[PDB]
Amino acid sequence: TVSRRKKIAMIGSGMIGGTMGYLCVLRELADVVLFDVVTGMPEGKALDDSQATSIADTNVSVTSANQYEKIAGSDVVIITAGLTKVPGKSDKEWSRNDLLPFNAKIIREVAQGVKKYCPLAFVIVVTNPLDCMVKCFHEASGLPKNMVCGMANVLDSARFRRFIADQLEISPRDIQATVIGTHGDHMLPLARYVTVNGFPLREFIKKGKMTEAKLAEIVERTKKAGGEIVRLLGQGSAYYAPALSAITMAQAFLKDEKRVLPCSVYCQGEYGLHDMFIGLPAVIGGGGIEQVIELELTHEEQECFRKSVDDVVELNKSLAAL
Template sequence: MNNHSKIVVIGSGAVGSTFAYTVLLKGLANELVIIDKNRDKAEGDALDLNHGLLLAQPMKIYAGDYPDCKNADIIVITAGAAQRPGETRLDLLQRNVSIFQEIFSEVMKYNQEAIFLIAANPVDILTYVSIKLSNLPKERIIGSGTLLDSARFRYLISEKMNIDPRSVHGMIIGEHGDSEVPVWSLLNIAGINQEKADAASRCYLSTEDKEKIYQQTKNAAYQIIEKKGATYYAIALSLARICEAVLGDQKSILPVSAYLSNYKGIDDVVLGIPSVVGRNGIEEVLDIPLSEKEEKLLKQSADQLKRFIAQITLPSEK
């Protein structure tokens, strides 16, 4: 980590404020700036967090405005229209694109060197939009991708097998949403490839088990939104994990939203793919081996997002 690290979070709603709290608990930065259109909310969050400094890590925390983005190492964008009960992530598209146009027109005046981390939904499309709006190197615009989906996936598998989720090695790739792809072919527990596990093994999953776990993973956000209105704890932890990888130059492999160019025949779209994440952002998108079915589903996921991207009118296209 640098001698002085600075994180800016734009958007102090449920996700942004929970992320800010996570930054404090983990001591991720020396300086944390909270920006929100509702200045009182940002100031209230900053004040509340400052009252906990004695019990956490030394850090400068304050409500700011776009000029405070200057010299930030990471700018995290959680601002956006909230997902409504019964609304798909893709339904949010046009409402959030206009919000991002406003944000980037301001941020770029003060900082063009930071790593940008996108968390608003639909995250893959908004990461793509951010690349186009900022005109920055693609590797410096990262979306939260399928890191949260993969965490949910591993948790559900661990519950079925009654083991620690940290001992489950598996991932979801593609869209953070309805067309996400479970990579069953690479799932392993302690090096045991699940697809080769004996039916009597603790690591065995039946076809029915797999389908149930996939559906629960895919629909987890809808379930939480229906019950309490929004998801924010696990996504805040996911964002903090990505920030750790960047600030610590950890070269961690994380399934984040990355721009794809000629990736298994997929071009000009952003999807959640395991990538090496370090101080320069996405340092490499890994070409992971997939089954024929998984590769087909990944291409279908890409095609679905590209259809929605085609409906977006960015300022340069007007």
Template structure:
């Protein structure tokens, strides 16, 4: 199959043709050293990786976007498809290669690649396969972009974020997992839809391990600044713990419903990750529930080097601080239980 050319120089048009269109300015000064280009790299050009890339482009978050994947033909096809939309997008240089050298000098590296679970395969076996894959991803990323932030999206995200931290040698504040940022968005949508308000006016966090054991922080949920549970109590509106737990499970199962219906999730995680990228690279200091180095927080013992989701203030330096959200005793117990489960699993990895 004949390879399509992606530049006019490959088609024989000389580089000096620009002189026919533009007259150079004499004695032009060099660019200011204080101004720099923002570069984001996305590893994995599957449904999730491309949804993230597309959202980053439409939200004008990067000057350079680099894509990496092990499948060269598909990767080049995705790059060309995005490049052909240049007339409809902010000016972003789009690169793609199977060689991690293309990621050099990145400000943010987003990892979406990883192995999927095979029928009958244990979770530990899946993690061992992902560990082998991540050795080939994280080490070259860290080597080519030693000052970057690393954002892990691949599942199981908490353990893979821990693996990324170990393999990269980066300080833990610069290694982040997407965690429960999307879970919390689903939670907010469900509440907002029922109350007929904008989801941006709902403050609600899911924390802990991403997935079935995530913890809904009911004690801190507010709508328009009004605490939900205390408001129900004040108006003598009865509710039961079982009802709250059913709502939490509905949030978790909403992802499975999307997968059942269309085979995978993509658009919501694309927006979630671009939302995190904006907070990080534009130093917005916004609070997001992301998977972070959690030992010592909320009663998690200092001997538990685990990554799990907690509400954190994010900026150009990565995780800047962890919010002191009030947790009930039951919420604290569930959070520590998640930490214990993750720690036991990590101990079997041998890294």
């Protein structure tokens, strides 16, 4: 075989993992390995997903695995391995930072498998608490700083954009709304940077298409979106938008698209941050994270951003304190 299909390993074959495998089938994006420590269930999803290729009229291979040797040759590795909530806790108290002790362990294990079997892979971490877990995976795997990132802000931005799109009665394709910072309560929906095809939202507000109050409401809703879905589902957390967000990042790498997809990236001076990962605007292409966009934030925005940075810093402290 002269021309081989791309290969994506889903480390974690739960709700997000299986849905990403499904997206690969629909788009014929890559062969899929549904990896998990659980036996049985991953093979069931592999059978279900592989059978979907017939109806999709596409041809990719979808298999399951519980041995890391199986992810060798993966071009991309997407990591969802982990818990979505603290066992026993009420949905009312769902908190992403509370997952630290349960998932750091898992991420370290995955990091060892990737370092050993597919160290040349582009890695997209999804597992919460996102920013802390990306740093945890990067430290343990030893992969290049431009080849490891965390999916979060594309999802946060997708919410921000959908809410704005509904208010303005315009497709979200034409709404550029971005959230940066940590994937949590202190995420920063950049209201000043919201545009309708590059036209500042401020011009729409002055024309009465949206009020300042509605905007503030949308910014708050964007922050609470994940928790609302957790409250409403009553079992697990979001997976359709998360899966598509991660796969869009994976595709940008595989096809060297050079898309602006805000995600948790390694900092070395950007926004004055060092030795850590946090959500920032970035361009993803065949060279992995090709550009980290440094915006001219206002004093007010910097204040908000420093709060987001502090949450990551303290979480990274607790991580180390283990």
